[PDB]
Design a protein around this ligand. Structure first.
Ligand SMILES: CN/C(=N/C#N)NCCSCc1nc[nH]c1C
Ligand SMILES: [Ca+2]
Ligand SMILES: [Cl-]
Length: 223
């Protein structure tokens, strides 16, 4: 997260770190046994880390649970990033509490202007590189479809929305991938892609989760 603030330990209790020897992607807990992330975060050997603030220090609220099953969206295209969504089933149910909690799926799609909370352990600099160890937060509005398409001509599908600031300075970045965009207690987005981070007229591009709710519920019900 560039131009954000320190969330505060366990204030984003649905935020997960995906770990393969190191944090490499975020995710969102949507029930005791399932995480939503980006398809582009897919790899084997995933350990899901919940109750995390400092990902380099055991602080006392962590649950470390291995993935049993990953499911990349059937229609994921790694070239266009269309349908950038993946489900991870945990080997055991997470123990749910104030610091480890599922986030609600949307019943309706969110609209441009809706303020959202974007979070992750990604890079904090526009130019150069510094990884925070504690979770960073950004309040960002959803941008209009027309702005998003003007910013990235030829690239924005019906499964994508822009959120952030066309003036730049405030964005998601490298390592925030797969992480949540929450708007009024609902998971409306997944950190998917962008052009650099926090550049003028190059806002963050998010997976539009409301399009995927029936696939998510169907998949959970049979897996
Ligand atoms: C992560 N999504 C973003 N939000 C915004 N801006 N940032 C876009 C670039 S981040 C770095 C990168 N680019 C390709 N692969 C990787 C890991
Ligand atoms: Ca920790
Ligand atoms: Cl529009």
């Amino acid at each position: 997260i560039v131009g954000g603030y320190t969330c505060g330990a366990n204030t984003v209790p649905y935020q997960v770190s995906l770990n393969s020897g190191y944090h490499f992607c975020g995710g969102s807990l949507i029930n005791s046994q399932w995480v939503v992330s980006a398809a582009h975060c897919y790899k084997s050997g995933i350990q899901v880390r919940l109750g995390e603030d400092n990902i380099n220090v055991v602080e006392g609220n962590e649950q470390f649970i291995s993935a049993s099953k990953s499911i990349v969206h059937p229609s994921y295209n790694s070239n266009t990033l269309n349908n950038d969504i993946m489900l991870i089933k945990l080997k055991s149910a997470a123990s749910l509490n104030s610091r480890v909690a599922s986030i609600s799926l949307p019943t309706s799609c969110a609209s441009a202007g809706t303020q959202c909370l974007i979070s992750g352990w990604g890079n904090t600099k526009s130019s150069g590189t510094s990884y925070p160890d504690v979770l960073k937060c950004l309040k960002a509005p959803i941008l209009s479809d027309s702005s998003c398409k003007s910013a990235y001509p030829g690239q924005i599908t019906s499964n994508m929305f822009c959120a952030g600031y066309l003036e730049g300075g405030k964005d998601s970045c490298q390592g925030d991938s797969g992480g949540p965009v929450v708007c009024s207690g609902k998971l409306q987005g997944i950190v998917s892609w962008g052009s650099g981070c926090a550049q003028k007229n190059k806002p963050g591009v998010y997976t539009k989760v409301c399009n995927y709710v029936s696939w998510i519920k169907q998949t959970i019900a049979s897996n």
